Paper text:
Polycomb Repressive Complex 2 (PRC2) is a histone methyltransferase complex composed of core subunits Ezh2 (or Ezh1), Eed, Suz12 and Rbbp4. PRC2 trimethylates histone H3K27 (H3K27me3) to mark developmentally repressed chromatin. Ezh2 contains a split catalytic region composed of the SET domain and the SET Activation Loop (SAL) but is inactive without minimally associating with Eed and the VEFS domain of Suz12 [Suz12(VEFS)]4–8. Pyridone inhibitors bind to Ezh2 in an extended pocket that overlaps with the SAM binding site.
However, humanizing mutations increased GSK126 inhibition and allowed us to solve additional structures of humanized ctPRC2 bound to GSK126 and GSK343 that revealed drug interactions for a model more similar to human PRC2 at high resolution. We were also able to determine the structure of hmPRC2 in complex with GSK343 and an H3K27me3 stimulating peptide at 2.3 Å resolution. Overall, GSK343 is recognized in a similar manner as GSK126. Additional electron density is present for the longer propyl group, but there is a lack of density for the piperazine region of the tail, possibly because it bends in a different direction compared to GSK126. Despite the structure being at a higher resolution than the wild-type ctPRC2-GSK126 or hmPRC2-GSK126 complexes, the humanized loop region of the SET domain is still largely disordered (compared to S5A). Notably, GSK343 is also a poor inhibitor of ctPRC2 but produced an IC50 value at least six-fold lower for hmPRC2 compared to wild type ctPRC2 in a manner similar to that observed for GSK126. Interestingly, while the H3K27me3 peptide clearly binds to the aromatic cage on Eed, the SRM domain of Ezh2 remains disordered. GSK343, UNC1999, and EPZ-6438 all feature long tail moieties (respectively), which are potentially solvent exposed when bound to PRC2 similar to GSK126. Comparison with the GSK343-bound hmPRC2 structure suggests that the tail of GSK343 is likely pointed outward when bound to human PRC2.
Numbering used by the authors:
A (entry chain D): 24 to 30
B (entry chain B): 196 to 253, 261 to 322, 360 to 479, 492 to 552, 567 to 579, 587 to 634, 647 to 740, 743 to 844, ...
C (entry chain A): 7 to 25, 34 to 301, 307 to 400, 405 to 414, 489 to 557
């Protein structure tokens, strides 16, 4: 799944 | 002599130029782009920041920044870093956001018909796209490489013939598709060696470019399908003495809407693959069943033209198009007393009337139903139990009946027998009121006051049947004038007579968008004038969609779908296209009430006030069961209010007592789509498309649903387009086919064919210049 | 000199302003574009709650700080921000900084005086990107979660209703992430979570009050086929397109077949309409290859993983090399100099030419030193190689050079010409270039700014 915030 | 190995070997060498040319192309494009670098514009003459110094500090809010300096090729820090404090300038905004929404909400005058949409295996999607790009890259190399190899029988055409003869074309093709190919190419491939060469070339191609190990691969077949003479064959966008005329009018009999008279419109049915069955003459038997009835009704029964009329008199050789024109005008004018082909055909062609005249000569009695008397226009006794005519939720849509006999189950009449109960025959059924006891005849109301009301000594049969009055059939109540949108704002007219034409009239009450008073709602709709109980308020418009289309939209939007015809499976979706009624909120104690109505063979949703409503009050209705979850089942003024109010487009806040904004409906995007729809038919000639698109662009803007108003719009069209029509021979010929088709339907009075004869002859004479 | 690439010079961390003690980030950085030539370059870095405004000045002291913070503005509302662009006051010509975020309003700040100029209200959801028109500094475009683009005018004639255009219809059906102007100010690119890249043609806007915006229902080019994933950054490069998508670790360079800005601007009734719901690409421009677009090159940007909302920036200026910059999600900043591609091709052609004309016996001399292809020829009675090509030549050397500079495969991966590591865990969100190209600023998570320089003045 795509992620916007930093890991 | 060639081998597969020798051909494959030569293909591999020729293929070396593909990346070479690619590198040259990208380098050329990069070099051209560097040369076109834009000079910076709009520079100030002075530096606006020059006077500003660091705000680092030697009860204001403060923030920290820590800096580090770096040097060398690796960015090594000079030290751990220095920290500074900065004062913060706090700036509040002066405006709140408007309530939340998704999509651009655009207004439509009437419901529009949506196409089915795709939901966009992933591994198959990706690989097919990669192959499509490679196929497009290689395709322009095939013919130059073929010319370079100069192998006998290795012809683009012969490779296509080879492909069509291979077994893989039983999987990839279909009958008639093979027919269209072998009409362009045939199956003779030339000499035995030419056949063998074509076979070896295909094998060598697929060996070099279609390696199964690779993702970016292409079979020769894939490249050949991109050929501009092959691809049309695999494109299913196709529309289609008496047999000569039947075929001459085929485009008009097939696409011409019975309701709105356009050839690409919102009526008809969309199939699962988005092929369309138009609500057409072809759905009621084509030209002949209607035309034969015209002739028979004729058998059971002015000034000469200004074009050297045959009625006073009585030459370049005729083409086939010209004699054909005279045939179908003759066949569809039929056994007429007051109109004859001569004058009209004379104006269509550029010929004197005496010329085309010289060329020319060269009821089983049926018992009436006990629940409905069509002569008194009355329902009787258990009528609610005997018919489903009034029950739109359970109705299925069948083609108007075009059978030969009485309208009984024995004759296969769908009106009598397709549903659980009989429904009345409507205006497009070929039976007549004198023959058929199921034929609807309109209502009998007349009054110097208001009439065709819900709470009426004799009810209005139209109201009882949950339908609006018909401008042709309901003669006593003044529906002819009140259902004409050109009278929509004649308040004197509408203060008496038929009160059951509100959707056709098309005038809505003044409303305004705003922030709803209900917490946890966003927008709502507010009355902008007082509304009396019983008045029509607004129509619910939107996209008409199928059940499966509804499920797809519910999925892709992580949805309010108004049920229009439950049994038939049609929903109205106003998420993007609709009108201000999409913003009306739910309350169990609403002040308006939706109702599904039959309106000239369209089903539409009206809202009626159930309370008195004053300007500025918010509108509500009880959503009830109107919005099912389909996946789970499977002068006018801005009023004074507490809520902020908004222009629907600019979203600018409106001020009390300002003129209420009323923006005319912008439909050019919708006209463009209908024009392009016609442009994409492969089997319409360009002279056909040009005329059909000109007529449609005119007639669609008039939103006709009753034939009562077509003669007027037809005459306006001929007058506005007369110069255009006579400027080019094909446009007159196509116009005459439209006229012939509407004469055959007995929907175009002879009177207007005579006047259009004068109008065209005038324009021709004016052009003589 | 013209072949220099940047190196890390300064970095800073701005105090965490979304408190959890470090999940704040800089989402945007933009250099002011309207200063006179030669003026000290100024950029704004936009965090979730603050706009940080810095002037950069070159130093002779390696230990001195070239960055100085001249204005610091807080959005005193409830919005969290992530987009910015610059405009100007149409009366006074003062700089205006536009800032937009999750409540869907554009705030326009008069930054030298530290006050609000105005708000632009109208969007139905958060704004994820802003761009100013290069042709008209009073025209700005906003891309929104409501799936629309709104075009706004700060010109005085439009003060009472400043939304001059809406790009709506069915071109997009999910949150937009990126909007960009063509240099002529009349073509707009948009893209986002629906994986569609759209090119729109703007009409001319009247220089008078507009009660309603013009609504455009159809882009002139539309395609979901360039990428297989959500698209979070698009831009024109002249008439060419640059774009990147999540999960692909590339920036794609591609072109629309038949598109040229030398041709007349088409009107809205020239746009294609979705007659056929199986077509994933449509174009007004279609005239060579049968397709409607051509993939040209792919810049390799490894280790973006599943991160999205990461943006690249090209430096494109007359008389200077075009430089592509991008920071990934694993503490790397990448550069490509597009002028190296042509010079490497020229050198490879000069090499292969002399290899045939002399049976494989040629001599290769570096450029940049005091020797000409003339002095070098005086010795043996010769191929000139760019000094930045670093190791006849070994196959491993030719392979390394082709990975960086060979443009012959559109689905190849072009390795960065310079790759600079970043200390700590860092995800790049945006890159900005100073007007003269001597500064390059990368901003990202942790409220961190990385400031790169070339052509410096430091001495000892
Ligand atoms: C076409 C009819 C428009 C209408 C009608 C009435 C009576 N009143 C109205 O206010 C509006 C206007 N509203 C819409 O247009 C609309 C709104 C919303 C919506 C609202 C509030 N909070 C959230 N969320 C909470 C945060 N989450 C992260 C995501 C979002 C979301 C979601 C929507 C809308 C349209 N489609 N969808 C989905 C199915 C894609
Ligand atoms: Zn129709
Ligand atoms: Zn005559
Ligand atoms: Zn029947
Ligand atoms: Zn019937
Ligand atoms: Zn009947
Ligand atoms: Zn009545
Ligand atoms: Zn009636
Ligand atoms: Zn009536």
């Amino acid at each position: 799944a795509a992620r916007k915030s930093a890991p | 002599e060639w081998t597969v190995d020798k051909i494959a070997s030569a293909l591999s060498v020729l293929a070396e130029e593909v990346p070479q040319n690619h590198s040259r192309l990208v380098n050329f494009l990069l070099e051209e782009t560097e040369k076109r670098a834009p000079q910076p514009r709009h520079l100030s003459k002075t530096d606006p920041f020059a006077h500003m110094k660091s705000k680092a500090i030697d009860g204001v809010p403060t923030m920290d920044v820590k800096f580090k300096q770096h040097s060398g090729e690796y960015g090594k820090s000079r030290n751990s870093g220095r920290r500074f404090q900065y004062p913060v300038v706090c700036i509040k905004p002066d405006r709140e956001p408007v309530p939340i929404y998704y999509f651009h909400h655009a207004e439509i005058r009437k419901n529009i018909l949506a196409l089915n949409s795709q939901l966009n295996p992933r591994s198959q999607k990706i690989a097919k796209r990669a192959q499509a790009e490679y196929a497009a890259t290689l395709a322009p190399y095939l013919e130059p490489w073929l010319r370079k190899l100069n192998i006998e029988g290795c012809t683009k055409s012969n490779l296509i013939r080879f492909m069509a003869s291979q077994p893989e074309s039983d999987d990839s093709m279909t009958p008639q598709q093979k027919s269209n190919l072998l009409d362009t190419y045939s199956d003779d491939m030339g000499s035995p060696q030419a056949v063998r060469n074509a076979s070896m070339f295909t094998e060598a191609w697929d060996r070099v470019f279609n390696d199964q190990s690779k993702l970016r691969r292409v079979a020769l077949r894939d490249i050949l399908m991109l050929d501009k003479n092959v691809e049309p064959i695999f494109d299913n966008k196709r529309a289609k003495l008496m047999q000569k005329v039947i075929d001459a009018l085929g485009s008009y009999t097939t696409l011409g809407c019975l309701i709105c008279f356009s050839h690409d419109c919102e009526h008809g049915e969309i199939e699962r693959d988005n092929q369309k069955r138009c609500f057409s003459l072809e759905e009621i038997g084509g030209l002949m069943p209607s035309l034969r009835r015209k002739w028979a009704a004729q058998i059971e029964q002015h000034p000469p033209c200004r074009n050297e009329c045959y009625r006073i008199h009585g030459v370049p050789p005729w083409s086939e198009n010209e004699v054909g024109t005279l045939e179908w005008m003759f066949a569809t004018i039929g056994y007429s007393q007051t109109l004859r082909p001569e004058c009209f055909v004379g104006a269509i062609l550029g010929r004197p009337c005496w010329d085309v005249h010289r060329k020319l000569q060269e009821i089983p009695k049926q018992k009436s139903l006990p629940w409905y008397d069509r002569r008194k226009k009355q329902l009787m006794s258990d009528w609610a139990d005997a018919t489903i005519t009034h029950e739109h939720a359970v109705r299925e849509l069948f083609a108007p009946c075009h059978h030969d006999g009485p309208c009984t189950a024995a004759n296969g009449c769908p009106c009598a027998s397709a549903g659980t109960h009989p429904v009345l025959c409507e205006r497009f059924c070929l039976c007549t009121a004198e023959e058929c006891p199921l034929k609807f005849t309109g209502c009998a109301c007349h009054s110097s006051g208001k009439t065709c009301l819900q709470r009426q000594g004799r009810p209005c049969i139209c109201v009882q049947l949950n339908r609006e009055c018909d401008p042709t059939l309901c003669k006593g109540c003044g529906a002819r004038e009140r259902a004409d949108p050109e009278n929509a704002y004649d308040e004197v007219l509408h203060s008496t007579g038929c009160q059951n034409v509100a959707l056709q009239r098309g005038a809505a009450k003044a409303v305004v968008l705003g922030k709803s008073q209900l917490e946890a709602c966003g927008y709502g709709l507010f009355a902008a004038e007082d509304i009396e109980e019983g008045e029509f308020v607004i129509e619910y418009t939107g996209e008409l969609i199928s059940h499966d289309e509804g499920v797809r939209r519910e999925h892709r939007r992580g949805s309010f779908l108004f049920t229009l015809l439950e049994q038939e499976g049609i929903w109205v979706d106003a998420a993007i296209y609709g009108n201000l009624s999409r913003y009306i909120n739910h309350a169990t104690d609403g002040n308006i009430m939706p109702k599904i109505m039959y309106v000239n063979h369209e089903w539409r949703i009206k809202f009626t006030a159930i309370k008195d409503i004053k300007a500025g009050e918010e509108l509500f209705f009880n959503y009830g069961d109107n919005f099912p979850n389909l996946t789970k089942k499977l002068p006018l003024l801005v009023p004074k209010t507490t809520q902020p109010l908004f222009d629907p487009l600019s979203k600018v806040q409106l001020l009390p007592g300002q003129p209420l904004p009323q923006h005319p409906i912008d439909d050019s995007w919708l006209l463009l789509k209908h024009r392009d729809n016609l442009q994409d038919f492969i089997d319409l000639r360009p002279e056909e498309k040009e005329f059909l698109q000109e007529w449609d662009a005119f007639i669609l803007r008039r939103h006709i649903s009753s034939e009562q108003y077509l003669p007027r719009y037809f005459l306006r069209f001929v007058r506005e387009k007369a110069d255009w029509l006579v400027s080019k021979r094909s446009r007159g010929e196509e116009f005459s086919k439209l006229v012939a088709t509407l004469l055959a339907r007995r929907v175009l009075p002879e009177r207007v064919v005579i006047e259009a004869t004068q109008v065209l002859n005038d324009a021709r004479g004016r052009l003589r210049e | 000199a013209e072949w220099e690439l940047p190196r890390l010079r300064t970095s800073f961390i701005f105090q965490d302003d979304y408190k959890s003690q470090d999940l704040a980030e800089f989402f945007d950085v933009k250099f002011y574009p309207y200063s006179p030539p030669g003026a000290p370059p100024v950029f704004a870095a936009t965090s979730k709650k603050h706009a940080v405004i810095c002037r950069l000045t070159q130093t002779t002291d390696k230990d001195a700080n070239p960055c100085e913070i001249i204005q610091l503005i807080r959005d005193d509302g409830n919005e969290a921000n992530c987009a910015s662009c610059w405009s100007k006051d149409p009366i006074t010509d003062q700089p205006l900084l536009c800032i937009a975020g999750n409540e869907g309003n554009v705030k326009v700040y008069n930054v030298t005086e530290g006050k609000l100029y105005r708000t632009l209200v109208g969007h139905g959801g958060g704004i994820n990107d802003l761009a100013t028109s290069p042709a008209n500094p009073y025209i700005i475009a906003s891309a929104s979660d409501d799936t629309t683009i709104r075009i706004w005018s700060l010109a005085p004639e439009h003060e009472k209703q400043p939304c001059v255009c809406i790009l709506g219809g069915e071109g997009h059906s999910y949150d937009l992430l990126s909007v960009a102007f063509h240099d002529n100010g009349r073509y707009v690119l948009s893209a986002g979570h629906d994986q569609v890249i759209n090119l729109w043609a703007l009409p001319e806007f009247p220089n008078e009050h507009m009660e309603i915006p013009i609504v455009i229902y159809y882009p002139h080019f539309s395609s979901s086929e360039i990428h297989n994933n959500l698209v979070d950054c698009v831009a024109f490069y002249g008439d060419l397109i640059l774009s990147r998508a999540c999960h692909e670790d590339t920036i794609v360079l591609w072109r629309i077949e038949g598109f040229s800005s030398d041709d007349p601007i088409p009107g809205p009734l020239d746009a294609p309409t979705p007659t056929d719901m199986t077509k994933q690409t449509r174009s007004y421009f279609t005239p060579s290859r049968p397709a409607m677009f051509t993939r040209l090159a792919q810049f390799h940007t490894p280790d973006c993983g599943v991160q999205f909302f990461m943006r690249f920036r090209m430096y494109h200026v007359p008389g200077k090399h075009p430089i592509l910059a991008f920071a990934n999600a694993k503490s790397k900043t990448f550069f490509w100099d597009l002028a190296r591609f042509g010079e490497y091709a020229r050198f490879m052609a000069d090499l292969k030419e002399a290899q045939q004309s002399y049976n494989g016996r040629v001599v290769v001399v570096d450029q940049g030193q005091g020797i000409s292809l003339a002095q070098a020829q005086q010795v043996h009675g010769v191929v000139m190689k760019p000094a930045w090509l670093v190791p006849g030549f070994s196959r491993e050397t030719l392979q390394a050079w082709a990975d960086m500079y060979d443009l012959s495969n559109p689905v190849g991966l072009i390795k960065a010409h310079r790759s600079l590591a970043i200390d700590g865990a860092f995800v790049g969100r945006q890159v900005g270039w100073s007007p003269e190209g001597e500064w390059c600023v990368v901003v990202g998570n942790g409220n961190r700014a990385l400031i790169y320089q070339r052509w410096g003045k430091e001495r000892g």
